[PDB]
Amino acid sequence: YCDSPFEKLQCEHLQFGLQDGFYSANFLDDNVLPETYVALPIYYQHTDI
Amino acid sequence: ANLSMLQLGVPDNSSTIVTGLLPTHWFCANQSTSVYSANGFFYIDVGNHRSAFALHTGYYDANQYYIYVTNEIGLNASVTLKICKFSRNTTFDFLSNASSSFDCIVNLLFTEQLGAPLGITISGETVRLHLYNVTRTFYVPAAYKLTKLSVKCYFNYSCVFSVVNATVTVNVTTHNGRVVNYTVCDDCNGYTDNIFSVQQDGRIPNGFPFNNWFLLTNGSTLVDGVSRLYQPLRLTCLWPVPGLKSSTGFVYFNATGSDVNCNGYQHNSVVDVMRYNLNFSANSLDNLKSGVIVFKTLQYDVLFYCSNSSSGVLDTTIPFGPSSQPYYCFINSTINTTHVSTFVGILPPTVREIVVARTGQFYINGFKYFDLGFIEAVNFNVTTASATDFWTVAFATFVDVLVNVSATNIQNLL
Amino acid sequence: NIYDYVGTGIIRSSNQSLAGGITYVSNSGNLLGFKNVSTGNIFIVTPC
Ligand SMILES: *[C@@H]1O[C@H](CO)[C@@H](O[C@@H]2O[C@H](CO)[C@@H](O[C@@H]3O[C@H](CO[C@H]4O[C@H](CO)[C@@H](O)[C@H](O)[C@@H]4O[C@@H]4O[C@H](CO)[C@@H](O[C@@H]5O[C@H](CO)[C@H](O)[C@H](O)[C@H]5O)[C@H](O)[C@H]4NC(C)=O)[C@@H](O)[C@H](O[C@H]4O[C@H](CO)[C@@H](O)[C@H](O)[C@@H]4O[C@@H]4O[C@H](CO)[C@@H](O[C@@H]5O[C@H](CO)[C@H](O)[C@H](O)[C@H]5O)[C@H](O)[C@H]4NC(C)=O)[C@@H]3O)[C@H](O)[C@H]2NC(C)=O)[C@H](O)[C@H]1NC(C)=O
Ligand SMILES: *[C@@H]1O[C@H](CO)[C@@H](O[C@@H]2O[C@H](CO)[C@@H](O[C@@H]3O[C@H](CO[C@H]4O[C@H](CO)[C@@H](O)[C@H](O)[C@@H]4O[C@H]4O[C@H](CO)[C@@H](O)[C@H](O)[C@@H]4O)[C@@H](O)[C@H](O[C@H]4O[C@H](CO)[C@@H](O)[C@H](O[C@H]5O[C@H](CO)[C@@H](O)[C@H](O)[C@@H]5O)[C@@H]4O[C@H]4O[C@H](CO)[C@@H](O)[C@H](O)[C@@H]4O[C@H]4O[C@H](CO)[C@@H](O)[C@H](O)[C@@H]4O)[C@@H]3O)[C@H](O)[C@H]2NC(C)=O)[C@H](O)[C@H]1NC(C)=O
Ligand SMILES: *[C@@H]1O[C@H](CO)[C@@H](O[C@@H]2O[C@H](CO)[C@@H](O[C@@H]3O[C@H](CO[C@H]4O[C@H](CO)[C@@H](O)[C@H](O)[C@@H]4O)[C@@H](O)[C@H](O[C@H]4O[C@H](CO[C@H]5O[C@H](CO)[C@@H](O)[C@H](O)[C@@H]5O)[C@@H](O)[C@H](O[C@H]5O[C@H](CO)[C@@H](O)[C@H](O)[C@@H]5O)[C@@H]4O)[C@@H]3O)[C@H](O)[C@H]2NC(C)=O)[C@H](O)[C@H]1NC(C)=O
Ligand SMILES: *[C@@H]1O[C@H](CO)[C@@H](O[C@@H]2O[C@H](CO)[C@@H](O[C@@H]3O[C@H](CO[C@H]4O[C@H](CO)[C@@H](O)[C@H](O)[C@@H]4O)[C@@H](O)[C@H](O[C@H]4O[C@H](CO[C@H]5O[C@H](CO)[C@@H](O)[C@H](O)[C@@H]5O)[C@@H](O)[C@H](O[C@H]5O[C@H](CO)[C@@H](O)[C@H](O)[C@@H]5O)[C@@H]4O)[C@@H]3O)[C@H](O)[C@H]2NC(C)=O)[C@H](O)[C@H]1NC(C)=O
Ligand SMILES: *[C@@H]1O[C@H](CO)[C@@H](O[C@@H]2O[C@H](CO)[C@@H](O[C@@H]3O[C@H](CO[C@H]4O[C@H](CO)[C@@H](O)[C@H](O)[C@@H]4O)[C@@H](O)[C@H](O[C@H]4O[C@H](CO[C@H]5O[C@H](CO)[C@@H](O)[C@H](O)[C@@H]5O)[C@@H](O)[C@H](O[C@H]5O[C@H](CO)[C@@H](O)[C@H](O)[C@@H]5O)[C@@H]4O)[C@@H]3O)[C@H](O)[C@H]2NC(C)=O)[C@H](O)[C@H]1NC(C)=O
Ligand SMILES: *[C@@H]1O[C@H](CO)[C@@H](O[C@@H]2O[C@H](CO)[C@@H](O[C@@H]3O[C@H](CO[C@H]4O[C@H](CO[C@H]5O[C@H](CO)[C@@H](O)[C@H](O)[C@@H]5O)[C@@H](O)[C@H](O[C@H]5O[C@H](CO)[C@@H](O)[C@H](O)[C@@H]5O)[C@@H]4O)[C@@H](O)[C@H](O[C@H]4O[C@H](CO)[C@@H](O)[C@H](O)[C@@H]4O)[C@@H]3O)[C@H](O)[C@H]2NC(C)=O)[C@H](O)[C@H]1NC(C)=O
Numbered sequence: 001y002c003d004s005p006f007e008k009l010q011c012e013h014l015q016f017g018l019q020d021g022f023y024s025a026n027f028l029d030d031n032v033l034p035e036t037y038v039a040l041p042i043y044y045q046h047t048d049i
Numbered sequence: 050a051n052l053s054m055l056q057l058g059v060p061d062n063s064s065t066i067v068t069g070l071l072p073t074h075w076f077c078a079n080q081s082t083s084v085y086s087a088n089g090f091f092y093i094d095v096g097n098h099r100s101a102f103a104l105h106t107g108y109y110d111a112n113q114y115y116i117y118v119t120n121e122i123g124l125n126a127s128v129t130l131k132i133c134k135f136s137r138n139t140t141f142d143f144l145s146n147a148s149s150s151f152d153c154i155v156n157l158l159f160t161e162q163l164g165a166p167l168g169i170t171i172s173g174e175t176v177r178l179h180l181y182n183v184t185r186t187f188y189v190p191a192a193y194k195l196t197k198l199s200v201k202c203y204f205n206y207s208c209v210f211s212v213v214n215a216t217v218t219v220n221v222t223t224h225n226g227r228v229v230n231y232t233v234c235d236d237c238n239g240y241t242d243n244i245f246s247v248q249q250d251g252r253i254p255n256g257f258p259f260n261n262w263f264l265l266t267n268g269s270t271l272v273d274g275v276s277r278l279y280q281p282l283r284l285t286c287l288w289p290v291p292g293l294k295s296s297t298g299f300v301y302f303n304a305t306g307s308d309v310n311c312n313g314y315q316h317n318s319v320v321d322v323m324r325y326n327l328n329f330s331a332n333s334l335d336n337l338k339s340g341v342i343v344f345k346t347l348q349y350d351v352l353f354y355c356s357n358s359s360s361g362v363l364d365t366t367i368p369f370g371p372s373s374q375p376y377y378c379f380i381n382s383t384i385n386t387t388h389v390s391t392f393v394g395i396l397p398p399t400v401r402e403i404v405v406a407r408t409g410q411f412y413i414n415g416f417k418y419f420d421l422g423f424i425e426a427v428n429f430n431v432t433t434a435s436a437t438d439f440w441t442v443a444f445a446t447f448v449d450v451l452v453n454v455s456a457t458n459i460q461n462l463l
Numbered sequence: 464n465i466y467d468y469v470g471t472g473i474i475r476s477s478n479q480s481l482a483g484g485i486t487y488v489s490n491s492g493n494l495l496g497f498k499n500v501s502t503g504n505i506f507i508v509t510p511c
């Protein structure tokens with residue numbers, strides 16, 4: 001199971017047990033995010049289909 | 050200065066409106082030291098003495114370019130211009146302060162006719178050089194910091210010099226190849242940003258802040274970066290303060306009529322565009338002009354107008370400058386008593402420039418809206434109580450250029 | 464989605480004195496900061 005802080009390194013490197021030395025780690029997280037929109041000036045006009 | 054024609058760019062037997070960095074007032078001083086703030090200088094030397102001028106900032110820097118000009122006594126004008134960095138330096142002195150020159154863009158020696166003034170001016174990162182017969186240009190980086198000016202010359206040795214702050218508008222009259230008069234508008238407000246004088250070969254003068262000169266495009270819009278392009282930026286005439294009225298008529302794509310008063314040089318050819326220019330104020334009380342635009346196609350006329358309602362039947366207006374509510378625009382035409390109308394689009398939030406090509410295309414703010422087949426003349430019917438609607442009306446032709454775009458504007462031109 | 468640039472990151476306000484463009488990109492196509500056109504304030508964009 002990939003839950004523990006050390007159980008995630010193996011789960012990321014696809015390996016059962018790891019050697020000694022330095023390793024690179026960066027754990028992302030999938031979620032939902034708000035959205036922003038900035039554009040050059042123009043007026044607003046809408047339609048529905 | 051009461052100086053040569055080519056140093057100003059005016060033809061024979063005419064009276065133009067020249068704008069830019071120009072010298073106004075001479076000095077006669079003997080204090081031998083005074084630190085000024087300026088952007089250029091003019092001087093005349095005929096005396097037998099050592100005279101030198103120099104431009105510098107307020108503090109030492111080892112990565113800065115310092116201009117330095119030194120005249121030398123002879124039979125002609127011996128001039129030594131040097132533009133480069135300096136090591137441990139000087140307090141001040143004539144005749145080559147310090148030979149610490151190690152990476153110099155320009156290091157020359159001039160021998161020109163005695164009795165002719167010289168000058169150096171700075172605009173952005175561009176350094177000009179007037180020489181009474183030619184106008185050179187160098188591109189030295191980080192040259193907008195050079196604000197101070199350390200002038201050192203004496204009056205008894207036949208030495209008078211002027212100095213420039215900024216952007217003076219003048220009125221120069223020429224006759225038989227010599228300038229006759231030189232007067233400065235205390236009136237004539239706003240002329241410094243919309244009026245210039247066309248140089249030789251139909252070029253556009255350097256150091257002109259492009260106010261409402263947009264980049265024409267068929268697709269997307271450029272935002273930043275240097276981009277080689279192909280734009281109509283070579284004039285054949287210019288009509289300053291036209292004062293178009295409601296009873297003028299048509300204009301026929303050539304400046305050989307009876308009402309055209311070109312400014313500066315004026316060739317004769319056939320043009321491709323007609324760049325208009327709109328004069329508007331910040332307030333929005335009388336920026337709502339009632340009128341139409343009448344084209345002239347080979348078969349039938351086309352009528353263009355805009356309104357603020359979806360059913361464009363009860364109004365006919367064209368706004369200038371900023372607005373507050375959307376406006377819709379239409380097109381009218383007739384084919385055997387059959388009035389046909391269609392919807393074209395919506396004006397941008399601020400209308401400032403209008404361009405009409407000759408092959409049919411019609412641009413607003415540098416964006417195509419529709420396209421006719423072939424246009425012969427344009428009648429800009431606007432009802433107004435005075436002559437204040439437009440700044441200039443310029444004819445142009447397509448020419449390959451190189452543009453430094455910043456924030457959807459034009460900085461330089463080459 | 465800022466001037467036809469897409470990605471992710473945190474947008475914070477700041478106050479710097481810069482005149483010129485309204486988009487400062489790196490040499491690898493990523494944004495580093497834009498500028499509201501109707502004022503002079505800029506903004507900073509960094510990955511999280
Ligand atoms: C800068 O750019 C400017 C814009 O281009 C430019 O200025 C303009 O340049 C144009 C290009 O050259 C130029 O156009 C030419 O104009 C000639 C002038 O003719 C008219 O004026 C003379 C008197 O000077 C007159 O005798 C003649 O009949 C023409 O009068 C016109 O009559 C029309 C009606 O018939 C009339 O239309 C109606 O008018 C009403 C009022 O009366 C009312 O307003 C109506 O609403 C309106 O529809 C029109 O208004 C009037 N025009 C004037 C000015 O009074 C044209 O002759 C010339 O066309 C001929 O030449 C071209 C080639 O150049 C040919 O291709 C073309 O087919 C024409 O050839 C024949 O021409 C004759 C007339 O000459 C026609 O009729 C014959 O007439 C004979 C007797 O005269 C005889 O009866 C015959 O049987 C008739 O058939 C004939 O049909 C034509 N075709 C054929 C196959 O034969 C051309 O259009 C324009 O004038 C310039 N000026 C402007 C626009 O103000 C400027 O030059 C540029 N700058 C520089 C430096 O270059
Ligand atoms: C958005 O997209 C749209 C898409 O359409 C774009 O619209 C197009 O825009 C282009 C750009 O203008 C249009 O293309 C043509 O441009 C010509 C410009 O002429 C220049 O440049 C060309 C390009 O290399 C040169 O080959 C020319 O020689 C000329 O060179 C210039 O520089 C030289 C440097 O030394 C000088 O020596 C020259 O003198 C010159 O200054 C125009 O001329 C084209 O117009 C032609 O067609 C018109 C309609 O057919 C004619 O009316 C017109 O005649 C004009 O000139 C005579 C001269 O007396 C006048 O009397 C007329 O009244 C009129 O004013 C031109 O006629 C040429 O073509 C016909 C038809 O082929 C020939 O029969 C003529 O003999 C004449 O010669 C040309 O063709 C012959 C071959 O037949 C060649 O041998 C000769 O060398 C000539 O090339 C035209 O405008 C293009 O048409 C536009 N699209 C459409 C659909 O119209 C927009 O621009 C885009 N927007 C943006 C912002 O980009
Ligand atoms: C404006 O900027 C200029 C820089 O461009 C500043 O310098 C002035 O530059 C002007 C020329 O652009 C100078 O004007 C000339 O002044 C000459 C002075 O010469 C006398 O003095 C010198 C010593 O200073 C001496 O060596 C010499 O021998 C003279 O004694 C004038 O000579 C000249 O005008 C005179 O000559 C013209 C035409 O003469 C030609 O033809 C003759 C044959 O007819 C021939 O013999 C000559 O050799 C020559 O080839 C003549 O038409 C003039 O007539 C005037 O007077 C009548 C009335 O009698 C009048 O109707 C007419 O319109 C003329 O006004 C005259 O006899 C030039 O004017 C000026 O001197 C320079 N200034 C200084 C201080 O040096 C200038 O300072 C700037 N000004 C300001 C206000 O900022
Ligand atoms: C800024 O201004 C000037 C810019 O040039 C600076 O230098 C001064 O320049 C003036 C004009 O040149 C000088 O005035 C005369 O200078 C003559 C020298 O000529 C030179 O230049 C000519 C070309 O023009 C050249 O050909 C020549 O070879 C030289 O190189 C002097 O000769 C002349 O002296 C005359 O006057 C004296 C009397 O003057 C004294 O006494 C007065 C009271 O009586 C008093 O008011 C005066 O102020 C002064 O103290 C006269 O004795 C001389 O005649 C003698 O010689 C003849 C033979 O030639 C003999 O026959 C006779 O019996 C006498 O024995 C002569 O007629 C002028 O001085 C001025 O001198 C320059 N200044 C200095 C300090 O030298 C000026 O310095 C600058 N200002 C500052 C503050 O720095
Ligand atoms: C600004 O104004 C100043 C003056 O304030 C102008 O300076 C002078 O302007 C005068 C005319 O405006 C010039 O006179 C001209 O002289 C020419 C002859 O010069 C020849 O020889 C000299 C050497 O001595 C040489 O350097 C030069 O290049 C020439 O080869 C004449 O050509 C000219 O007009 C003559 O021709 C016209 C007809 O012109 C038509 O036909 C031409 C083809 O032949 C064609 O190219 C033209 O475009 C045009 O379509 C003719 O009508 C003239 O007749 C005159 O004389 C009769 C009496 O016989 C009289 O009735 C009539 O009314 C005319 O007065 C003439 O034969 C000029 O005469 C003078 O040279 C200028 N001086 C200087 C120093 O420049 C200055 O030019 C103006 N600025 C500009 C940009 O023009
Ligand atoms: C780009 O657009 C901008 C838009 O603002 C424009 O800026 C303005 O430009 C004008 C220059 O034209 C600036 O100057 C103003 O001029 C006013 C002129 O007043 C005289 O004329 C009045 C009417 O004349 C018009 O109408 C007649 C027909 O009636 C027509 O023939 C004329 O040609 C002209 O079109 C007239 O009312 C007035 O006095 C009359 O009435 C009295 C009775 O009251 C009578 O006794 C008189 O005999 C006479 O008949 C006068 O004769 C001037 O009034 C105005 O002054 C106001 O503003 C100044 C400055 O703010 C104040 O100090 C002052 O107290 C007034 O409130 C002003 O001087 C004008 O200032 C510009 N606007 C701004 C905001 O700067 C640009 O010029 C355009 N660019 C180009 C190139 O055109």
Ligand SMILES: *[C@@H]1O[C@H](CO)[C@@H](O[C@@H]2O[C@H](CO)[C@@H](O[C@@H]3O[C@H](CO[C@H]4O[C@H](CO)[C@@H](O)[C@H](O)[C@@H]4O)[C@@H](O)[C@H](O[C@H]4O[C@H](CO)[C@@H](O)[C@H](O)[C@@H]4O)[C@@H]3O)[C@H](O)[C@H]2NC(C)=O)[C@H](O)[C@H]1NC(C)=O
Pocket residue numbers: 084101102103104105107108109110115116117135136137138139140141142143146147199
């Ligand atoms: C000959 O060559 C020199 C360069 O080699 C050209 O330009 C000079 O460049 C130097 C730097 O390389 C400039 O040096 C400056 O000196 C100032 C001293 O100014 C004196 O004069 C003013 C008024 O005339 C007095 O107020 C002042 O007290 C001095 O007596 C310094 O003020 C500058 O740095 C110091 O001040 C700044 C603040 O401005 C501090 O921040 C610094 O830490 C430091 O304390 C600066 O170093 C020099 O001004 C330039 N001009 C001249 C004439 O030397 C010359 O143009 C070139 N040609 C000639 C004819 O000299």
